[PDB]
């Protein structure tokens, strides 16, 4: 695709994040870098709004996958990066078991040279005691493989994953996503055959931040198409 080509150098990032759970606004906005050709995402987000009224690792998926480092011999799988510059929209639910759930809508497309990313989140039905508002999640690493299927009615993609993120008990708590991606033009796309991004992460601090922040590491290989 010509998209591709905008991401074989470094590429700066921005994040915007509109967030609402339960009745708990907050803002995140962040600032990094991705380099396609070696799936490596740097990111540091901050919360403007004061404290973060959930866990930080329950933003980590919403809070870029055309960053993904594509295999050459799937690169005519990459649908992210095919929609570029003018870019997509990527919906989700997350289903926390036992526990509320994030709708998301994302807006992911080049200004000039800068990837943007702005995320709308809405969080209902939670409890104020349990594993989410109640903060009992580890911030251990996230690692997992995106199950990403073509949508031909939609000139778009598909996906689907778990995360079982860490609870203080030593239980786990699983956060079922479902995925949609329409592309924002009007004309062809990569339209891929069943693959997935395997996808890792870890969280840090910046030492000399005093704002409740998170800093995440990443990197995102596609897999799963043999040559
Ligand atoms: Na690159």
């Known amino acids: 695709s010509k998209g591709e080509e905008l991401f074989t150098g470094v590429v700066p990032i921005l994040v915007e994040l509109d967030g609402d759970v339960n009745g708990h606004k907050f803002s995140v906005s962040g600032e990094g870098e991705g380099d396609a050709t070696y799936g490596k995402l740097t990111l540091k987000f901050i919360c403007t709004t004061g404290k973060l009224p959930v866990p930080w690792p329950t933003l980590k998926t919403?809070?870029?996958?055309?960053?993904?480092?594509?295999?050459?011999?799937?690169?005519?799988?990459?649908?992210?990066?095919?929609?570029?510059?003018?870019?997509?929209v990527q919906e989700?639910?997350?289903?926390?078991?036992?526990?509320?759930?994030?709708?998301?809508?994302?807006?992911?497309?080049?200004?000039?040279?800068?990837?943007?990313?702005?995320?709308?989140?809405?969080?209902?039905?939670?409890?104020?005691?349990?594993?989410?508002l109640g903060h009992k999640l580890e911030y251990n690493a996230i690692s997992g493989n995106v199950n990403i299927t073509a949508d031909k009615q939609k000139?778009?993609?598909?996906?689907?994953?778990?995360?079982?993120?860490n609870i203080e008990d030593g239980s786990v708590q699983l956060a079922?996503?479902?995925?949609?991606?329409?592309?924002?033009?009007?004309?062809?796309?990569?339209?891929?055959?069943?693959?997935?991004?395997?996808?890792?992460?870890?969280?840090?601090?910046?030492?000399?931040?005093?704002?409740?922040?998170?800093?995440?590491?990443?990197?995102?290989?596609?897999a799963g198409i043999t040559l």
């Open 62 to 88: 919403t809070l870029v996958q055309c960053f993904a480092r594509y295999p050459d011999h799937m690169k005519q799988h990459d649908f992210f990066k095919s929609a570029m510059p003018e870019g997509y």
């Open 92 to 132: 989700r639910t997350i289903f926390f078991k036992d526990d509320g759930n994030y709708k998301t809508r994302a807006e992911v497309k080049f200004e000039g040279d800068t990837l943007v990313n702005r995320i709308e989140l809405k969080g209902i039905d939670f409890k104020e005691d349990g594993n989410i």
């Open 176 to 222: 079922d996503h479902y995925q949609q991606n329409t592309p924002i033009g009007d004309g062809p796309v990569l339209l891929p055959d069943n693959h997935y991004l395997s996808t890792q992460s870890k969280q840090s601090k910046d030492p000399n931040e005093k704002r409740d922040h998170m800093v995440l590491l990443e990197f995102v290989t596609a």
């Open 155 to 165: 000139n778009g993609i598909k996906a689907n994953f778990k995360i079982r993120h």
